């Protein structure tokens, strides 16, 4: 086509849904990950991870306000991904790496993973 | 804005 | 911090977004534009636009399903909106310039108000 | 990836 391009236009859209999780505006399910809970949106979850859209694209689960992870998942690894999937930062630090990547192979965040098994690899 |  | 950023996640969400929205995936509202009807997702409408997120904040009309835009609002116009919205890309044609324009001013899409004002001066 |  003839379109323009606004350079900028996918991270303020980005930021703006970061914004409207802050003040908990329309987000539409909880995440479960043992004693934590966290909201979020469905779609912006779904964007991000694999495990997510198989989950919401599912004709019974797409309905649920609520989603209990695997007892093995760490929340604060899930909360560093959930931070990442609505701002594009990854807060991977020497002690939270393994949980983060564990996290990321189960929610299927391929990208996250690679840079996991990277900075695993210079450090042995 | 650019041609993208 | 000391994050790192993964430079295309906000595109891979907008180009997922608008692959949820091809597939009428968790839209949650319908805009109707004098006789065309557009699904979409309220946070990506609020996300690109001062209109829709004052309407979506409305606590009586974040629960509307059904969203009348102005009679005077040029459903092409729109359309060209919605698909930049979820892409980036901008239509902007001799032809669709003036209706693009209006209706970007009345959605409160400043970027894209800007972009017409200066390919309007041009052209004069 | 990138340092921001
Ligand atoms: O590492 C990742 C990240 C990710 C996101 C999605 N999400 C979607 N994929 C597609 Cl093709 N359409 C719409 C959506 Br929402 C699927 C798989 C994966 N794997
Ligand atoms: O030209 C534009 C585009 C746009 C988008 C929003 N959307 C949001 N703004 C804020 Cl501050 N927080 C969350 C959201 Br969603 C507000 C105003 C405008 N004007
Ligand atoms: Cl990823
Ligand atoms: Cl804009």
Redesign the interface.
């Known amino acids: 086509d003839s379109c323009i391009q606004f350079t900028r236009h996918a991270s303020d859209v980005l930021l703006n849904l970061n914004r409207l999780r802050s003040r908990d505006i329309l987000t539409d399910v909880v995440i479960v990950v043992s004693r934590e809970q966290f909201r979020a949106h469905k779609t912006v979850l779904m964007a991000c991870s694999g495990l997510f859209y198989s989950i919401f694209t599912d004709q019974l689960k797409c309905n649920l306000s609520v989603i209990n992870l695997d007892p093995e998942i760490n929340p604060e690894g899930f909360c560093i991904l959930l931070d990442f999937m609505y701002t594009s930062r990854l807060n991977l630090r020497e002690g939270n790496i393994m949980a983060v990547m564990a996290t990321a192979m189960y929610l299927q965040m391929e990208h996250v993973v690679d840079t996991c098994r990277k900075f695993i690899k210079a450090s042995e | ?4």
């Not at chain 2, 804005?1 to 993208?4: E, K, L, S, T």
């Open positions: 804005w650019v041609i993208p």
